[PDB]
Structure formats: C-alpha cells, structure tokens
Amino acid sequence: MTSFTIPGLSDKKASDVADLLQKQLSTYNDLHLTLKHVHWNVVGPNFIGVHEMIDPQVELVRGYADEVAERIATLGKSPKGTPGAIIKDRTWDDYSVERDTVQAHLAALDLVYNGVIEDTRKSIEKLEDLDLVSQDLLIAHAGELEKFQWFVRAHLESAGGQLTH
Amino acid sequence: SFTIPGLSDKKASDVADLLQKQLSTYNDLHLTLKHVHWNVVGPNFIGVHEMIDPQVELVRGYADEVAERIATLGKSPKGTPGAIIKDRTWDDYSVERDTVQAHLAALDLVYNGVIEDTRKSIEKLEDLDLVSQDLLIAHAGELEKFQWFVRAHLESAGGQLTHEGQ
Amino acid sequence: SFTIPGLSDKKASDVADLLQKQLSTYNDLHLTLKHVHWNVVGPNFIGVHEMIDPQVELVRGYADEVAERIATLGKSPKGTPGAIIKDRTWDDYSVERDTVQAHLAALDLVYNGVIEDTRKSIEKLEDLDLVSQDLLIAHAGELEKFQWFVRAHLESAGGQLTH
Amino acid sequence: SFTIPGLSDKKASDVADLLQKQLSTYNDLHLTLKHVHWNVVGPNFIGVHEMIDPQVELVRGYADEVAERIATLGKSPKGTPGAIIKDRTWDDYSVERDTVQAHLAALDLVYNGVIEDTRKSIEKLEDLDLVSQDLLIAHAGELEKFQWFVRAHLESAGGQLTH
Amino acid sequence: SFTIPGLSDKKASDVADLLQKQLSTYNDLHLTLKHVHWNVVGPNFIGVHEMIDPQVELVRGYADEVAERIATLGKSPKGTPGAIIKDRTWDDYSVERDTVQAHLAALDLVYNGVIEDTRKSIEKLEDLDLVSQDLLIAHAGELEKFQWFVRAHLESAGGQLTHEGQ
Amino acid sequence: SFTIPGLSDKKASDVADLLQKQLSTYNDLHLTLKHVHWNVVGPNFIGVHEMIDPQVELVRGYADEVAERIATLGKSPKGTPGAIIKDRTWDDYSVERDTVQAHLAALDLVYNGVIEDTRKSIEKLEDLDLVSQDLLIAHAGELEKFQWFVRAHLESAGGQLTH
Amino acid sequence: SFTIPGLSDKKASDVADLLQKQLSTYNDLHLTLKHVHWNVVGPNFIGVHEMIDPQVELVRGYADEVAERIATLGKSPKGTPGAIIKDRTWDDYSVERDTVQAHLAALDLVYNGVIEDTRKSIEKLEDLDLVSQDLLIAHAGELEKFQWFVRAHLESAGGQLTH
Amino acid sequence: MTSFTIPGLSDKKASDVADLLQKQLSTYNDLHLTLKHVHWNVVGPNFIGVHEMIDPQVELVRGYADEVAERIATLGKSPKGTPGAIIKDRTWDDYSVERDTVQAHLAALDLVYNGVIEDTRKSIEKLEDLDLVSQDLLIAHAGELEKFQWFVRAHLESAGGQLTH
Amino acid sequence: SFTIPGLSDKKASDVADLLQKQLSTYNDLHLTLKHVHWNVVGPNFIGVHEMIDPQVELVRGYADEVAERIATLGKSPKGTPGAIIKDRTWDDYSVERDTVQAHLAALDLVYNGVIEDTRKSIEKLEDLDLVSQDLLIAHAGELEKFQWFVRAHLESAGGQLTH
Amino acid sequence: SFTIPGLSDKKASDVADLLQKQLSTYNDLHLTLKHVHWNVVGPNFIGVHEMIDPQVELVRGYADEVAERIATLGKSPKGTPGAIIKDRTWDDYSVERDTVQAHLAALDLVYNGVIEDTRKSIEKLEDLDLVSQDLLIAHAGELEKFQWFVRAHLESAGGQLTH
Amino acid sequence: SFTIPGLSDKKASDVADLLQKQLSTYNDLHLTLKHVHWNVVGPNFIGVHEMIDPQVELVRGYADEVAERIATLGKSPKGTPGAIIKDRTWDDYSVERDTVQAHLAALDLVYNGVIEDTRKSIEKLEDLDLVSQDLLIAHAGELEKFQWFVRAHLESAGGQLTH
Amino acid sequence: SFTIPGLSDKKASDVADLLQKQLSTYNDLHLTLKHVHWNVVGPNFIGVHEMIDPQVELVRGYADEVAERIATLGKSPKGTPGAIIKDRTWDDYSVERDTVQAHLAALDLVYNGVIEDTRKSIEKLEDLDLVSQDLLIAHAGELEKFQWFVRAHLESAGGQLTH
C-alpha cells in the first residue's frame, strides 16, 4: 500500500512528518476534552471568570485538531482520532483532578501545558529538515498555545513573579 | 451536599448516572464523527465531508449541555479520554480511510446504538426528572434527523437500505 | 424497510400517518396566510399585512420539519398541490379581497381547526413517539400565540370576541 | 375600480390575468420543489437536497411579487390551494421517493413548461405593461439558471442530456 | 465635450432633460414624503408613520441614481431647492397636520402624477437610451408598489377608493 | 464613604436622593409599559403592541444607568418591588384589558408626571452635578418623544387631544 | 368568553392562575436580579456583575412569554408593581451593598423558592395543558442552570455550600 | 386653535422654541439637498476622495432634519418640510456653484457652513432660557456640523494655517 | 443538443457567440483593472487605488454571470488565458508604473471600447433573446457609471477631458 | 488664522489650551491602562484583564475626539510621546507586575486626578464654548463609571476603601 | 529606485523576479479554476461546482498580495493577459465541457506544478527575504490542502489515485 | 522565575529584551501615526486622513501582541509614557501641521528605522525562539506594505522619491 503525497516530498520525509502530526493530533484531542473537563469541574469565588476563559481555548484547540488531521491526510496517510487512537498515542497520565478549586485545576493544567508546549517545540525543530509548511502550521499553534498557559500561569503568579503552585 | 430544589438525592443520583453515560457517548460520537470527516474518499466526497461538521458541532454542544446538567444535579461530570473509555459499552470505530459508502454504512450502525439507547433513557427519565427528560428528547430529534441524512445516501429507490453490515 | 431505532414497525406507520396530515394542514395554512396577506384592505392594512409574513414563514418552516420527520420514520412525505387537497378535511378559504376584520375573523375559524386537530394529534402520540409529540407541542404554542394576535384585533373591552 | 396610472382599464385586466396564472404556476412550483427536497435518495443526496432550498425560497418569493403586482393592478390575487389547481395546465408531480436522477429528470420537464410559458407571457406584455414584463424577464433568468443546474446533473461529456 | 460611448450628442441631451425632470420630482417626493411622516395623526398613526420611511429612503436613493446618470451623460444635475422649484410643474404639497386618511388620499394624487409622468418618460426613452429606460422601469415598479400600499388603506371592501379628492 | 472626585459629600447625597426617585419611576414605568403591551386590544392592536417594546427596552436601560450612577456616587440603589412602592408617589396603573385608545390616553397622563418630575430634577441638578444633569436631559428627549407617539394616536385633525 | 381551541374554561382558568403567579415571580426575580447586579462588591466584582445580566434579560423574556400565554388563554395579565406584591409569597430581597458571597448566598435561597414552585406547576400542569407545561419546563432548565452558577461560587472542593 | 405641549412648558415658551426649530429644519433640508448637489458636480484629480466624504454628512444631516422636525411636532406645532417651506424660511441665496472643481465647491461650502454653524450657535444660547432639552439636541448637531466644516477647511488650508479661498 | 426552452438552436447559438466575446472582454478587463490597481502612483494614490477594487469585484461577477448563461444556452464557456487572447480584439493594456492621470486616461479609452461593443450586443440581442439582453443592459449601467468616475478625475470645470 | 464660526479668537485659544492638556491626559491614560492590562496577576486576573480593554478603547477614541476638536478650533494638536510628557503634571505610573488589588488601588488614584481636572475644565468652559463643554461632559460620565468599577473591587461591605 | 529597508537592490530584484512568476501562475490558476467551475458536469456537479469558488477567491487574493509585494520591493507587477502568457511555462488548460472526474484529475496535475514550483521558490527565498518566504509558505498550505480536496474525489478505498 | 516550557532562561531574557525595545517602538508609532492623522492638510487630505487609521489600529494591536509575549516569557512589559521615551533611539516626530506630502515624506523615514530594526531583530531571533520570530515576521509584512502606501504618494512616474 502506497501511492500519493505532496508534490516535492519524498515518501520517507512524508511519513516521518505524518507520524509526527499524528502524535500531535492525539495530543490536541486529549487536550480539548480535558479542557472541557476543567470547564465543568471548577468551583470557588472566581468560578465564572475561569469557566469562560477556557471556551475560546477549547474551540481554538479543536480547530487545530482538524487542521493537523487533514494535513496528515494531505500527506497521504490516515488520521486516527477515535477515543482509542487517543489512548494509544497518549504518553501521559489521564487528567486526575475533578470537581475541585480553580487554583487546583489551574495548577494542574499548567503542567499539562508544559507537556504540550515542550513536545510541540521539539516537533518544530524536527520539522525544519522535513517540511517547512508543516513547521509553520505548528509554530502558529505554539504561539496561541503558549499564550493560554500564560493566562493560566498569571492566575497562580506571586505578587513578585514566582509561580504559586 | 446539594441538588436541584425539589429533587430527592435518590432520583438525582439516578439521573446523574444516566446522563454521565449519555455524556461519554456524545464524546465518543463527536470524536468519531470527525474521524470519518477526515477519512472519507470518493466522488461524493465534498458533499459528505461538509455535511458532518454541523453534526459534530451540535453533538459537541450536547456534551457540554449534559455535563453541566450532571453538575447542576450535584455530581461531577467526567470528560477525559480515560472516562469516555470506561463508560464505553461498545467498541472503537474501526473504519479508516475508506469510501463514503463504507463510512456512512458503519455510521448508521453507530447511530442505531446511540438513538436507541437514548430513547430508553427517555421513558426511563419520565419518573426521575421531566426537565432532563425534555433535554434528551430535544437531542434525539436532531440525532434522528441526522441519521436520516445518513440513511438517505444508502437508501435505494424504493426504500431499502444497502448496509454492507456483514 | 427501515425506521427510527426503537419504534415498532406499526407505531412508526401510525405516527407517520398523523404527520402527513399535519403536513397538508401546514401547507394549506401558509398558502392561505399568504393569500390574505395580499387581499386585506382598510385603515389598518399595513399593520396586519406585515403581521402575516412572520407566521407564514414560521408555519412554512413547520411543514419542512414534519415532512422531514416523516421521511426519518421510513415513509414518504407528500407535498404536491394534489396531495394537500386529498388530505383536506375543510374547505378552501373563501374570502377574496375584503376588509382586515373580514379576513381576521375568517382566519380565526381556520386556526380553530388547526389548533384543535393539532391538540388531538399530540395526545395520540403520548403513547407512540415522545420525540414526535414534543415537536407538535412546540408548533401548537406558536400557532396558539398567533391566533391570540388575530383575536386581539377582534376582541372588545369585555374580552368578548366580536366576529 | 382603480388601476396603475397610465394603463387602460382593458390592458390592466389582461396583464392581471396573465400574472394570476404565473402565480399559480409559481405556487405549484415551490410546493413541488420542496416535495422532491424530501423525497430524493442516493449517493449524492445532500448536494442536490441542499440545492433545492435556495430555489424554493427564490420562486417562493416570486409568487409574493406577482400576486402583489396583480393587486396593484386592481384585481385580486388567488393563492389558496383550490385556486392553484383551477389554473393548473399540467399534472401533479408524480414521482414519490426515488433517486436523485429520477427527480432531476422529472424536474427538468416541469421547468420546460414554466420556462416556456413564462417566455410566452413576456412577449404578450411587450405591448401591455413594460414594468410588468421586466419583472418576468428577471424571473426567467433565474428559473433558466436553475434548470441548467438540474440539467448539469444529467448531462454527459458530449453535452447530450441523458434523461 | 463628452458623453456615453455610442450615444449621439442629440439623444444624450434629450435623455439628460428627461432625467433632470425626473430628478426634481424625486427630490420633491422624498421631501414631501417626510412631510406627512411627521404630520399624520390618528389611531392608525404608528403603522403609517413607519411605513413611509423605507419609501423615503428608496426615493432618496433614486434621486442619487438619476443625477449621476445625468452626469454620466455629460450634462450637470441640479439638486438645490431653487432648481427643484423651477422644474416643478405641480404645486407644493398642501396638507399639514391632518389625519392618516387625509394624507394618504392626497398622496395617492401625488403618485398618480409621478407614476404616470414616469411611464411617459419610459416609452419615450425607448428610442434614446435603453439603459436609462431600464433604470426608470426599475423605479416605476417600486413607486407603483408603494402607491398600492397607499390605496389599500383607502380601498373599500369590494374595491372602490374613498378619495376625498374634491 | 467615597464619592465622585470633586463633589462635596453633600451635593453627592442630594443627587443620589434625586436619582433614586427617578430609578423607581423608571422601574414602575417599564413594568407598566409591558403591562399595556399585553392588555391592549382593538383594530390597531399589533401597531401599538409593538410600538411599546422599544420604549420598554429604553426605559429599562435608563433604570440601569441611573442606578449605577447612584452607586458611583457612593450610595446604594434600591430596585426591588418594595423599594419601588416606597419611593412611588403615584398609584398603580388601573387599566387592565381595555381598548388601545384608552391605554394610550391613560399612558399619556402617566408620562405627564414622569416628564414633569424629570424636568424639575433636571433643574435642581444644574447646581449639584452636570454630568448627572446631562444624563436626565438625554432621557427626557426620548421620554418626551414617546409621549408624542402616544398623543399622535389621540390627536384630532387640528391639534386637540381626546382622552 | 373565549379560550384556546380544545380547552375547557375550567382547565383554562386553572392554568391562567398558575401562570399569573409565575409571572409575578419572574417580575420580582428580574428586578431583584438587576438589584444585586448593582450592589455587589468585592475582588470578584466584574465577573459576577456581568454574569447576572444575561440571566436578567432571560427572565424578562420569560415573563413576557408567560403573560401573553395568559392572554391567549383568555384572561388578563397583571404586571404592575402593585400586582407583584399581591401575588408575592416571599419577602422583599433584603441585601443592600454587600460582598459577592453575601448576595450569591441570598440569591441561592431565592432560586430555591422559584425552582420549587416552578417544578410544582409543571407537574400540576400535566393534567391541565401540556403546551404550557412544556413552556415552564424550558424555563426550569435555564433557571436551574443559573442557580448552579451561583452555587459553583459558594462550593468548596467537596461539593459543599458555604452560606 | 391650541391644545397640547410638553409637560412643564408654557405655550409661549413652546412657540418660541418651535419657531426656532422650524427655521433650523428648513436649514437642514436646504443643506442636505445642497450637499448632494456638490456630491455630484465635483471634478478634479481628487474627485473620489471628496465624492464619498460627503455622503456620511448628507445622511447625518438628513437625520437631524427628522429629529428637529419631530421635536417641533412634540411641542405641539406642525413641521413644514416641503420644497416651498424651505424657500420661504430660507434667508440665503440658493447654491450657485455647479459642475466645477473640488476646490471651487469646498470653498463655497465653507461659507455655507459658516452660515449654518453661526445660526445654530445663536439658537443654542437663545434656547438656554427656553428649553434645555432642545438646546442639548442642537448642541449635538453643532459638534458634528462643525467637525465636517473642518474636514472641508482642511482641504483648503495653507501649509501654515491660513485658508486658501 | 439542448437549449433554453423556447429558443431555436440558431437563435441560441448566435447569443452564445455574443456572450463568449463579452466573457473574454470581462476577463481582460478585470485583470487589467486589477493591473492598474497596483501600478498607480501619485498624490491622489489611495483614492484611486481603492476605487478600482469594487469595479474589479463587480466585473469578476459579470464574467461568471455571462459564462454560466452560455452554458445554460447549451454551449461551453472558455475562460483560460489562451481563450482571452483568441477573442481579444484590442491590445494588451500597455501602461506600467505611472501617475493616476496616465492610467485613468488609458482606462478611459479601454472603457470606450467595452461600452461600445456592449451597447451593440444589447441591440443585436433584441431579436435573439430578451433575457440575455436584460442581463447585458444591467452590466452596461455599472460599466458606464464607473467610466464616469474615471472621467470625473480628468474633467476640468467645463466638462472637458484632459487626456 | 481661522476658527469656529461665531467664536472670539481669544476664546477659541483658551478652549484649545484646555483641550490640549486634556489630550495628553487621555494619551497617558490609554497607555497606562494597557500597561496595567499586561502586568496584572492574581486569582481574579482574567476578569480585570478583560475589563480594562473596553476603557482603553474608549479613552483612545476620546484622544481623537478632543484632538480633532483642537484642529477644528484652528490650532494644532500635539500627540507624540514628547508632547504627552511635556503636558504631564503627574508622575509616570510606577507599578510594574503586581496584584490586581495593587494596580486597581493605584488606578483609583490616577482617575481622581483625571476626573477632577476634567470637571475643572468643564466648569471653565461653561462661558467659553458650550459645544466643547458638552463633549467633555460625555467623557466624564464614562470615566467616572469606570472608576466605580475600579472601586467596587476595593470596596468593603460597608462602602469604604482599602488602598 | 527604492526598495524594502534592509535589502540589497539585488536580493530585492531577485525576489521580485520570483514573485512575478508566481503572480502569473496564480492569475492563470484562478482563471482556470473558474473555467472548471462552469464546464463540470455529472451526478456530483453541484458539490464540485461550489467547492471551487472558495479556492478561486483565495487564489485571486494571493495574486493581489504577491503583486503588491512586488511593487513594495520597488519593481512593477504585470497582470494583463499578455504578461500572464509571457511568464507562463505550462500550456493552456485543455479540458472543456467534460466530466467532473476528468477535470479533477486534470486539475490535480495543474497543482502538482503550482505546488512543486512554489516549494522550489520557498527555498530560493530562505536567503533573499524571509517576509516573502513566509508569505509563499502560507499560500502553500492552502494550495496543498485544496489539491487534497481534489485527490479525495479520485482516491481508491486504500490510497491509490485514478486519473 | 518561570518561562516558556523548553527555553533557556538566558535565551528567554535575550528575547524579552528585543521585544521590549520593539514594544516602545510600536507605542511611539501608534501615537505618531494618529499625530499626523490630525495634522495633515492639503487637497488629498481626506484620503490620507482615513488611510492612517487602519494602520494605527494594527500597530496598536501589535503593541499588545508583543507586550503579552514579553509577559509570557516571564519578564514584565513597560508600556507607560516614560518607558517609551527611555527605549527611544530616535527623535520625537517634529512635524506639526503641514502638508500631506510633508508628513508622508517624514513617515517614510520613520518607517525605515522601524522596518530596519525589525528585520535586525528577526535575524537575531532565528536561533533564539522561532515562535517569536514568526510573530515579528508577520508584523514586518504589514509594516512594509504600509510604507509602500506612503511612498506611492511620493513616488515619481519612474520609481523615484521626492522628500
């Protein structure tokens, strides 16, 4: 089985890229489900502010999932996005926190993001030698992904500058 | 230590349970829904490719509805990949990059499961909480409506479905 | 040879029959509404003229809701002009060009039929298809609010309807 | 007892008659369009399904344009279901639930009638009411473009219509 | 020293003349139109008060259309109070603060003048410039359409108008 | 205690008392406005039924502005049903399901008060706070314009009102 | 002397009484809701301040919905400050300028009353009129969801309310 | 003939105000017709910029005409806005310029505006003792009316600051 | 082998040839139009730069309109760069980076050709097909108005073009 | 060498002086506002973060209104970084990254000077130019409301402030 | 001569040559894209007929960006029909009124070139101008994604294409 | 005490330094831009007047993007009037009220320094942080296009500039 790919890319390069984007895909799908999970199980005096702050991120990530996925399909492979595909590519523990304080979740989400950002970064430099278009696509996400973590961190920041985890 | 005013803790917990299953269904649904959105092939591609998105958006909406209902009832909704797989009474959508016909066929089967199990949870909710009962009745029509768009592509002149279900 | 997962083949066809009638009712309704839309005259023309449109569009949409529901049940919806005449249990709107009061009073009667028959079909469904019933309950609410609009133009202080 | 400033009492009624027919034609048309909207099946269902709606709404609006024009001429527009059957010069759409190709091919024929009769009414007006004519010329353009959409689904390389 | 490509200076000047009259008509119209908008009284007030605005906006649009057509033809449009009064072949709308019935009655008369004179300028333009001819045919329908909304308030059951025209 | 920078704790407390009264007037008005919205009947029903909604939304807006202006001055707005009767100097709206002609006339009187008391306050404020004065002046133009809308339905072909 | 086609003047009257109380409830609620919207203070001010508006706008609609339903049924709605106090079965919200927590804990208790009384009417309406039951059921879901928002602010990890 | 007026105003005050607003009305009607007149008869290399710049002013003035008019009606009198009413209240010569340069018209419009602004100003202080609401209504127009003249003047301004009429 | 219901394959063919040339004209025009949109320079840059876009967007539509009309008539539209050059009867716009004046004077002459050829087709179409004539007439009014804008920039007080 | 029709040249200058001082104030504000927009941290971070934007955009608009007013009056507005520093009569905002409570308390003070100086200028314009006075009055109402927003976060259950 | 601040007159002239080629490719593409839009026929007509428009609008956009980027570099974009054939290295699109399956396949090849040449240029630009490189990279993702849309209609249940 | 996951703390600081210098540049620009927005005079006044606004709004957005990036990276953005003056390496815009040609020529220069310094930072970020490099690249494309707009007004028929 084999047949088509993007004009200008070797089947080898194409595969390595798709295999990268597929792990990125399952990352997004796990992320936006987890993001909605927090959306719901948050409590505290600052509930509402954080309840909503999350939606724009959920919708934003859900779109990234779609971009990344169809890009894989463009490369010639098959995007896997069923609950199973998520659990099989997933290399981190499932989100532990449930109905708990805003502080609790934000601290936990921070770490989730350290993972997502760090992994994305890696795949960005690994893509320089493979496909620039795909590296660009990922760089855009990183920006928005990174900024949200700031939103998250800013809630835990010490009057000075230290993270109050 | 709280629930909807007028509801008993017993009924509340029973409703929460029904809904939480409904939640993991929807989650698996709008994940699988986008799964074919990407993996369909054929001449009638663009039409079916685009037809799925609205349904995906809708279902994703229903997930949120149901979960904040579970919460409003007092319990705590579970929406992570792990949870969705625990409550999962069926198996992972299998079809990968296949034809429009193959997918729509497999989809019909998935919806039979969803629709049916949802109507069960409806007459079952008639003793527990009418409000919640109403909620699902709402969704049902839309799920049913969509499964029809799916069956229409499989339907044959007279009225017989061509399900490769084998 | 297929129907909604969960309904008996029999329940299906009985629900499908009710709707198909409700469908021709809606089609006659919106044809009729647009009819008086053009044939109303008098000092308060514009107000009542403008009033009909939103309901026409509303019930005009219910037909598409119902017919499509029928299709989802397995049967085939009939929407041709001949079909709407074969399901008619009342007569063709008689009033041609006339006053606002004239049409409004006639429209009241017509709505009495639609609203009543609809109310009856809602009860039969209570044991057939809840999803299907809830659909009509929704419609009824809007049909009912409109008749009130029609009636308000006919009412008189003591809330006695002067037809 | 009144008409458009500038038209003879006679010219008026002749134009008004033409339109009233064009009106029932439009009403039958959009009832019919919505009909096949629900009764189409096959691999390309969604595309053709979605396609009908915009035209339904379009011709659905032409009727309101024409009827209102008639009213402006002095006469009364007839829009009831009975009226549309009394003006019919063709038969009730026969196809029930069938394939896309089935309905499309039938729809072609129907449009041949509407388009043709409309073309004829446009010429008669050239000597009756220019304003009135220009109205139909507009419609014709849209009816014509749609039939092309219907036909494109039936065409085949050599541009030979396989019915 | 210029005109539409394909048009002769003679025909052009003739068209310009027709249009410039059409222009001062429209101007008087959308000024008089707002004049009743303000001066109507009665139980059916709000309905007629609001019904006029769209027509006013429309006509105001037509003024602009016709004037930039005159300009495109090479001549120069006149749109000042002075000009509108020179080309004016009729008299100033007279009705002040009166009933809805009084105004709508007087309005009908004004429109007879407008509509009629416009249809004249239509068959008259069929030899000069088809484009321009089309333009006015467009407006005509809308003017006619509106005069109908006006007559409908005066119409009586059967079909007779109740014009206090005395 | 705190208040607007540049206002004596007094002027500030005087303004607050003034606006607080206005708040109740507005609240009672937009409640009564809606009351009329439902209970009107007659030939010109729809026209007046709808004419009222905008005003209702406007007055509701004004209440939120006045209240928030109060809180800005350092005091505390009271907008519960009780608070609105404690401040209220006029009596409950009497008219229930009556004729549109009757409601308008009644509403006319209601506005005489609203408008008269407002201008009184617009005066007392010229010495206390201009920002607050300019506020009620804007509300006056709109309240005053609505009364006209109301009086126009009661005007006689000449200028005399008929309650 | 006139009601919804299919209801007995008795069944209709009982429905109208239920709603009318519901109407007064909605009016007290959206005034009281807008009341806390102005008097909340605290570090989490802006979030709650704004959160309440949408709920308020929603209840304002529900009241209009319920009232016009009453009228449709034949009776006459009362929505004046005086009528809110005659139907009111609770006390005038009594919290002035105060912390968010204070107001939410108060609001929580208010919604307890509203939701309970509503739930009752819903069940009591199954034997009276289903259309109206459906209406109140929709109202219940949003009122019930809002209350949750209120509570979510007062919860503490182990789902316990801090009143 | 006499019967109603705004609650809180004497029939005398009401009349003087209405008689003021009526002259303001005819001023607006003359203005927006004249404004459209320029809209059409402008030429030059900077045509398009000025052609459009005018519309927002035309629509804006046309609205003022409506406000002012209905305000008169509110006072109890009858707004006159027919071509005749305009010419009868008009105290200035009809707009002279026709198909001519942008510079030509702008210079002429400037003067037209000096008239309109100056008159409005006058009616604003004459209204202090009559009706504040009506003075407010006129003050708003003046602001927007004055700013447009600046737009107009800015086209004739000398590199330094003198008006190049 | 198929055409608009009511036209002879001959009358239809002649119309298709007229349009097809019109189509190529529109394509050259919107490419050339967008061409000057990039190469204009001068103090009055921004005004003209932007003014051209709308015209461009409009012609792009007209081409699509005309082409699909061709297809409707039965024939096949050619809109490739190669086809524009086969139907083209004039020279490739030849002005590069240059002053606004330069480009407008060039554009003026281009529109002279377009408008003339269009006017001819309009008259030539009265005996062929009125629907298509109407289409081109609408196209004429906007093309004719745009040319005016172009000229208005080149005029000098006494309506004289500065080429 | 020119000014508003009907203004003492000496008056216009006096007015243009007040507005210019008002301009730099606005510019300093809509920079400072964004500054605390980026540097706020804390549990209620998001709420205050987003709350500041609408104000920043408002004041930025005011920057423009006032400036373009100064230009109308005949003089020239200075809106560069240097100019804003030259008109300054207060020190640069000294709070870098800090808590929400910290920044809010600092802004509360900043707004005391802005509002106070604005009312001072409103009182001085009374006999200088009513048009420009109205303009500055509008601004005060909005600037004073925003400061309330800032205070409500610092406000104690009994109307006191923690700085 | 002038160019982007920080670019040698050379790099600047090299980029310009590159983009100018791209400009013609885009122009020929969006002309050909529209060509297909009209000449497609078959069962899935509407689906593909419409699928193309967006891409057409996108490519047209890209052409305007590339051209303007060129002018920004100090050179002069050429976008007339002639200029597009002088730069064009591929031949005119052959397929006329054919099957949708055929056009897609043909279009597939067209994109192989467009996409292949682009990436080539995205490379050569890494040394000349990054802003310009990032530009063509964005266009690549979209051009590349459309090809997929095209190839998806030609895919076999497995992964092999069928021209 | 924290930064982007996967960034050398030393690198993050180096990046945050470049961005801060970029921030003050942006702020100085979106003030200066509005400054020439208010002070431009001349025949083409309106065109350039309105042309500057979209840029002002863009750059203002950039102010924010960069700032919030600096905050993400861990440090704190300085956005007050003082700070913008401290980072400055150019003199304050010295053109008060002058011609369009005057201001445009002055801005052309201002933009040389902005673009040049931006590309310098783009080249320095290559091996510092690709995310932040992409961000500054986007800005360059837009900032460079706007400068072309400025030049096209100063540009001579043969691509030269008059300063």
Ligand code: NA
């Ligand atoms: Na039930």
Ligand code: NA
């Ligand atoms: Na003819």
Ligand code: NA
């Ligand atoms: Na004063």
Ligand code: NA
């Ligand atoms: Na690189």
